Write a protein that binds this ligand. Structure first.
Ligand SMILES: Nc1ncnc2c1ncn2[C@@H]1O[C@H](CSCC[C@H](N)C(=O)O)[C@@H](O)[C@H]1O
Length: 452
RNA sequence: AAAUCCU
């Protein structure tokens, strides 16, 4: 019978989907941070529960051959790069395995093709967006990242997985906030002004948005602070402000203001251009998203007489990438600022067959089913939570030949696939694509197809 | 349960 602060020798024999090592000691399953399969360790017992436990590595007796000894990545492991300690080919194997394991555990599929995960040539310096808290650490305003399961800011200049320019811009903005004596936010004391900095930068265009996320509308000498950052970085076309007065883990509140220039950046994906608002979603890994889409598009086998639904449209990138190669494109997007981009993105690219509606995807499908639209293909790309039961049920009743499901969470996709199978759709292909190198997150594309 | 970390 184990208990807190005991040290025991264990072999790690698996990984959780989130990246934590698994060892099984005396009826307990232990989740050990920074422990890879086959590693011998002395495990410190942190917490004992009924069926599970939690552990810390006290000593490595034997490490993995697949361990990455990079000391620079180890600082990030407890946070933004939670799989950095595993070598890249094995990360890919791990992610492929996770997709297979989820389709079985959740949906009872063992017989379907799951191609190996498509990885990056150079899996670094990829993210086009960065969200960076601003905090006081030892009486000094610092940008960085939060330690896992915490709000303790780890000071950091080199983010490893982000666009190097974004790191330069965030370091510049940190130094400017220090010089202008603008107070960082304190969560516990509920005092200060500057909560987070959000910096999006177009993968091809290089055009930069800077969102200053603050506790109150009034920012003291912000016009001068912008004036200086534009001289360092001429590529800033937009400086936005966001007010968030709540005590919440959520980044933005309701109010968005434009402090300078445009209220959008412009970037390329596949052939076309796309305007992108601050509150709108843009795929963080443009390089691999283009691949993610090109897989989905090839899976969909598009004819000129097809009628596509692009559910969870965003700024319209999937729908508009295919609109010139088909009859009609209908899309739905809940966030007004994104679906307004989507409308302009259609006009920019000369696409007059791209019709959009601002609503929940659940509701848009219900109206489109009543209104008598005849969709042949359905592309879906929901957030982690996945799809609603009512959306799956409605989409089945449209009699759509193919459904292509893009996902950033295989757990919810496996569930939702399970329900598509109960309504006469069959899972044909699956291709995982590594949008998030050095992290536990798997992106996926699954082709469902109907039976007569 | 909103988003790479952001209980
Ligand atoms: N119930 C709902 N109905 C429609 N859209 C929703 C929704 N819940 C969240 N969303 C939206 O779904 C989108 C998911 S991500 C959008 C992906 C887009 N195709 C792109 O690659 O750019 C977000 O834009 C989000 O605002």
């Amino acid at each position: 019978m184990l208990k807190k602060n005991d040290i025991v020798e264990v072999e790690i024999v698996d990984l959780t989907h989130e990246g934590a090592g698994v060892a099984k000691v005396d009826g307990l399953v232990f989740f050990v941070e920074n422990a890879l399969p086959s590693e011998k360790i002395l495990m410190r017992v942190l917490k004992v529960n009924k069926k599970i436990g939690f552990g810390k590595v006290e000593k490595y007796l034997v490490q993995s051959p697949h361990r990455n000894q990079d000391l620079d990545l180890a600082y990030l492991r407890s946070g933004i790069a939670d799989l950095g300690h595993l070598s890249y080919p094995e990360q890919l194997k791990f992610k492929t395995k996770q997709v297979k394991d989820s389709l079985y555990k959740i949906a009872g599929i063992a017989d379907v093709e799951v191609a190996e995960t498509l990885g990056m040539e150079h899996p670094v310096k990829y993210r086009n967006k960065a969200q960076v808290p601003v905090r006081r650490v030892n009486g000094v305003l610092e940008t960085g990242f939060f330690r896992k399961n915490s709000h303790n800011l780890m000071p950091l200049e080199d983010f490893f997985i982000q666009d190097p320019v974004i790191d330069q811009v965030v370091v510049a903005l940190r130094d400017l906030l220090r010089r202008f004596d603008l107070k960082p936010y304190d969560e516990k004391e509920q005092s200060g002004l500057i909560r987070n900095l959000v910096v999006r930068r177009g993968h091809y265009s290089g055009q930069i948005m800077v969102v200053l996320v603050t506790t109150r509308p009034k920012v003291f000498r912000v016009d001068q602070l912008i004036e200086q950052v534009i001289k360092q970085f001429p590529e800033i076309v937009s400086v936005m402000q966001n007010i968030n007065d709540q005590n919440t883990n959520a980044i933005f509140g309701k109010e968005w203001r434009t402090l300078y220039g445009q209220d959008y950046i412009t970037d390329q994906m596949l052939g076309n251009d796309f305007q992108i608002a601050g509150p709108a979603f843009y795929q963080v890994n443009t390089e691999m998203a283009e691949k993610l889409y090109q897989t989905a598009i090839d899976f969909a086998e598009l004819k000129k007489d097809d009628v596509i639904i692009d559910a969870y449209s965003g700024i319209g990138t999937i729908g508009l990438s295919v609109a010139k190669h088909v009859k009609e494109v209908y899309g739905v997007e809940l966030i007004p600022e994104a679906v307004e981009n989507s409308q302009k993105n259609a006009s920019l690219n000369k696409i007059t067959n791209a019709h959009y509606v601002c609503d929940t995807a659940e509701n848009a499908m219900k109206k489109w089913l009543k209104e008598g639209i005849q969709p042949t293909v359905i592309l879906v790309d929901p957030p982690r939570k996945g799809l609603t039961e009512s959306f799956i049920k409605a989409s089945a009743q449209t009699g759509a030949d193919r459904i292509a499901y893009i996902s950033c969470n295989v757990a919810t996709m496996a569930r939702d696939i399970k329900l598509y199978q109960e309504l006469g759709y069959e899972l044909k292909k699956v291709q995982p694509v590594d949008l998030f190198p050095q992290t536990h997150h798997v992106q996926t594309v699954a082709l469902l197809s109907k039976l007569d």
